[PDB]
Amino acid sequence: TAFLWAQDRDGLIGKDGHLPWHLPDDLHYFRAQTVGKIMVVGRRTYESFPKRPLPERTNVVLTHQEDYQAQGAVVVHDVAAVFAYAKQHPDQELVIAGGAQIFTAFKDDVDTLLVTRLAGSFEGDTKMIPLNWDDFTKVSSRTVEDTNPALTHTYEVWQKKA
Ligand SMILES: NC(=O)C1=CN([C@@H]2O[C@H](COP(=O)(O)OP(=O)(O)OC[C@H]3O[C@@H](n4cnc5c(N)ncnc54)[C@H](OP(=O)(O)O)[C@@H]3O)[C@@H](O)[C@H]2O)C=CC1
């Protein structure tokens, strides 16, 4: 399983349950990556989905109550069950597009970590938590140069190391 997330250089992920900055460029990449794979997105996150719904994709909506019905994605209230499901299908890749609470709960045990850095900065009421360098290491790093300083960003991939 792999976790994909993006955060501002200053230390911001979003605000009012929405993305203050618009980067369709990076978003297209994320959408393409999740193609042919099962991904789980938190309900609060779903509210931020700027390009919804997401047809022709195995998306699952995460909610507190199993009884609650969600459209476009399967509703599961058991965090442990999702993990076991992925374990059952090792061949299938798992990608998580939030929410932050979900990220935190599964932050301690993640096989693949995806980190996106933004050259620009945005103001918001949500700040990203501290990252343990010892817990994870970067397998490789990629540099992307855009005309606008804010547009330019660096993409890196981290994996668990013994
Ligand atoms: N740095 C980053 O890349 C990330 C950024 N973000 C940003 O944050 C926003 C979402 O974060 P935030 O608003 O704090 O809320 P979350 O998206 O983290 O909220 C998660 C929701 O999932 C459901 N849920 C949580 N825990 C469980 C559980 N144990 N069992 C079942 N369902 C569960 C709940 O739904 P309910 O209570 O509504 O039924 C809960 O409100 C996104 O819209 C985005 O803007 C989100 C993820 C990652």
In order, the DSSP letters of 88-155 are H-TTS-EEE---HHHHHHTTSS-SEEEEEEESS----SEEPPP--TTTEEEEEEEEE--SSTTT-EEE
Nearest CA to ligand 1 atom 48: 98
Number of structural domains the chain divides into? 1
Q: Is residue 20 a contact partner of residue 6, using CB atoms and an 8 Å limit?
A: no
Q: For residue 77, what are the contacts with CB-CB under 8 A and spacing of at least 6?
A: 62, 63, 64, 65, 66
**CA separation for the pair 113, 141 (Å, rounded):** 12
Say if ligand 1 is within 6 A of residue 15 CB: no
Nearest CA to ligand 1 atom 19: 44
**Domain at 88, CATH number:** 3.40.430.10
Which tokens sit at 27? Answer: 């978003």
Domain extent, residue 149, equals 1-162
- Mark whether 26 is an active-site residue: yes
Set 54, 113, 114, 118: catalytic member:
54
Binding site, annotated residues for NADP(+) = 5-6, 13-18, 42-45, 62-65, 79, 97-102
**CA separation for the pair 93, 34 (Å, rounded):** 9
Q: Is residue 116 a contact partner of residue 6, using CB atoms and an 8 Å limit?
A: yes
Query: Quick one: 45 exposed, middle or buried, by C-beta within 10 A (0-12, 13-18, 19+)?
Result: buried
Q: What share of the chain is helix, strand, coil (3-state, %, to 5)?
A: 20, 35, 50
| Of residues 62, 84, 85, 88, the one with CA closest to residue 75 | 62
Ligand 1 closest atom vs CA 76: 31
The Cβ of residue 63 has, within 10 Å, a number of other Cβ atoms equal to: 19
3-state secondary structure at position 70: coil
- Mark whether 8 is an active-site residue: no
The experimental method behind these coordinates is NMR
Query: Quick one: 102 exposed, middle or buried, by C-beta within 10 A (0-12, 13-18, 19+)?
Result: buried
- Mark whether 131 is an active-site residue: no
Which tokens sit at 92? Answer: 């299938």
